[PDB]
């Protein structure tokens, strides 16, 4: 009972599931394509807590995998390298055939730890995690993904750290060096943060010993 998209004589129209349309000429299977779209194009925030809060763990329900031939380039993508509080891997390893999406600009890894009760991390609004051209309903460990939907129609690594990943009370950091971190805030975009990381690193005004120095961005 899945609807398809079809092009009208003018603009785009909803193709029916039940009605036979006389103008809907289908001469080949090459006219039916699976296209992936990124939800960032619908205004979904790409901040770290904004995306992680949209994901969560649940038990019982099995994963599903779907196939694309084409899709949108993503500006912002994520991975996860999250372990349970005692190090016991929150996500299952991506199975054979699951690879990250073709291309993006800013890819985040959000490594870290947190409570992860459940069998899988599912998207809360039901968006798909887009891997390669094989999107799925769950997040797989170590493999990057885009956040998106399936239409059915006729760079750089940031590697933020995470604490308390699978719960509501969390912390996230941008790593400049092994001893140097910056606290994240949603008002600061990847461009800001990366310009900031180059300034800190290049100026050298950061920890240079063995101890951690963690910076907060001034309120202004």
């Amino acid at each position: 009972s899945i609807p398809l998209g079809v092009i009208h004589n003018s603009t785009l129209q909803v193709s029916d599931v039940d009605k036979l349309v006389c103008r809907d000429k289908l001469s080949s299977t090459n006219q039916l394509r699976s296209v992936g779209l990124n939800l960032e194009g619908n205004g979904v925030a790409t901040d770290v807590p904004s995306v992680t809060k949209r994901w969560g763990f649940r038990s019982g329900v099995p994963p599903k995998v779907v196939n694309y031939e084409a899709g949108e380039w993503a500006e912002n993508c994520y991975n996860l390298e999250i372990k349970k509080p005692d190090g016991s891997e929150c996500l299952p390893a991506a199975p054979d055939g699951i690879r990250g999406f073709p291309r993006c600009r800013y890819v985040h890894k959000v490594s870290g730890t947190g409570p992860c009760a459940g069998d899988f991390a599912f998207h809360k609004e039901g968006a798909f995690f887009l891997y390669d051209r094989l999107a799925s309903t769950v997040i797989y460990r170590g493999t990057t993904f885009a956040e998106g939907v399936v239409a059915f129609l006729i760079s750089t690594t940031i590697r933020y750290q995470a604490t308390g990943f699978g719960t509501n009370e969390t912390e996230y950091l941008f790593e400049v060096d092994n001893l140097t971190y910056v606290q994240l805030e949603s008002r600061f975009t990847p461009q800001f943060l990366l310009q900031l990381n180059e300034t800190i690193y290049a100026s050298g005004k950061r920890s240079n010993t063995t101890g951690k120095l963690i910076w907060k961005v001034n309120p202004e």
Partner: antibody
Amino acid sequence: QVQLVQSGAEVKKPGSSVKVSCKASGGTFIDYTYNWVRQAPGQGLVWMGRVVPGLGLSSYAQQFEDRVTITAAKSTSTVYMELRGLTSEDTAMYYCARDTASFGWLPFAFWGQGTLVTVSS
Amino acid sequence: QTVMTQSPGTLSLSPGERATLSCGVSQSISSTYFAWYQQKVGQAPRLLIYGASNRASGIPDRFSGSASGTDFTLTISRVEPEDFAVYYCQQYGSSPTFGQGTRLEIK
């Protein structure tokens, strides 16, 4: 020698907060780390936190986390700190000290007079 | 984290006598991330030595020192009346730390 100028002593009641500041003059505000430190008589000196206007970042001593907020007014070349949740144990001289970040070194070469923060009831 | 203990925590010498002070640290500090200070009573401390060896501006040649590992040492060839100060050990390469301070008193 770049100077740091501070306000005089103030008495606070427990549970309140004090805002202190150091006016920087005779040199660059942006180029240096302005560090806040605390010294009560007989206790020695500890670091509270810092601001580096050039990076726009600040950092803190763990024992002063949340209670101490450090900022700066680039426009007035003034270093600011607010200490809150004050108790009688917080009585101390509060200082700014400017480091030698512009020289490639992080220790303190320039020091203020010290503002006394007194907390009592 | 770079915990320092100054020893002696106090010295007692007649002015004109030779004195030494050292600080132990719980972890190695590169000498380049360590400095010595002289604190006069009622005053902010004055930087004496940079990188645990280089005299700071305006510092007399009677002051000297060196360091490696966890061993930081300050000496004054002759302690003048003006030198009976509290000396401090500072770590500054990361979140900074200080030792408790050592007072050099007049005997």
